[PDB]
Ligand SMILES: N[C@@](CCCC[B-](O)(O)O)(C(=O)O)[C@H]1C[C@H]2CC[C@@H](C1)N2Cc1ccc(Cl)c(Cl)c1
């Protein structure tokens with residue numbers, strides 16, 4: 592009944608300017624009214640300002656902004672933890688996907704038995720030793736998964752993080768651009784995923800059925816939905832940093848969100864990677880933002896049948 596909205600204008604998990612304007616873009620697309628109309632009591636935390644870190648040199652000549660991303664996530668986790676502890680379902684607007692380190696950490700701080708539904712073209716599970724880009728937004732899951740920590744070096748600014756997710760407690764949906772070390776990780780740790788190919792075969796209804804059976808088939812658990820807008824086909828969500836052809840249709844995305852709502856267990860949601868500056872037109876920017884609002888609203892009960 593109660594929803595907290597937090598703007599997290601992270602951009603330092605990656606290298607493209609503009610994703611810090613995602614939260615404003617999503618708000619301007621009418622998020623707050625849409626949620627209110629659904630009966631959500633709202634607490635708006637506004638857009639957070641994160642503490643800068645002087646001299647945040649690369650880590651290992653490769654990983655960018657680790658102290659800045661680490662500290663921003665620590666601060667974000669504090670806000671998320673507080674909101675969830677006060678009884679709010681916590682919606683965080685990104686910002687790049689490295690913020691999931693903070694939202695999931697903060698969420699788990701109040702709800703340790705949470706499970707994660709990760710909707711994304713990408714697995715975001717590179718470690719600092721496997722990333723080819725050095726961009727933390729392609730690594731957040733590696734810092735969160737319990738089974739991987741012997742393979743994850745300690746980054747400056749990251750010491751506060753305690754891995755809070757087990758490999759059996761996250762399911763990916765949407766995957767179509769997975770790096771070879773990520774594929775190894777997913778297979779070696781038996782992490783379950785439904786790639787676009789699996790969706791082509793099963794259909795989104797069976798995908799959602801199987802996802803919930805894996806995560807909440809044995810017991811009810813609070814659900815953390817981490818939704819990267821690039822899960823959608825680039826024709827629908829062009830304003831994003833790493834678009835990949837052959838993504839979710841509009842209807843598939845809504846269906847995912849509807850099924851999330853239908854569990855009655857949604858406890859926190861990330862909507863990340865909307866970058867209005869990468870739109871070639873104001874129309875492309877607005878449609879991406881409108882789509883983000885649609886995902887969030889559907890996750891909190893908007894239906895297509897009244
Ligand atoms: N895994 C990425 C992309 C992460 C995107 C993060 B997000 O939050 O938007 O899902 C990364 O770690 O940076 C990949 C790196 C690389 C640049 C963009 C895309 C994805 N590329 C895949 C790729 C391409 C070429 C090579 Cl040689 C390799 Cl190893 C991997």
Ligand SMILES: [Mn+2]
Pocket residue numbers: 711712713819821822833
């Ligand atoms: Mn992605």
Ligand SMILES: [Mn+2]
Pocket residue numbers: 688711713715728819
């Ligand atoms: Mn992502």
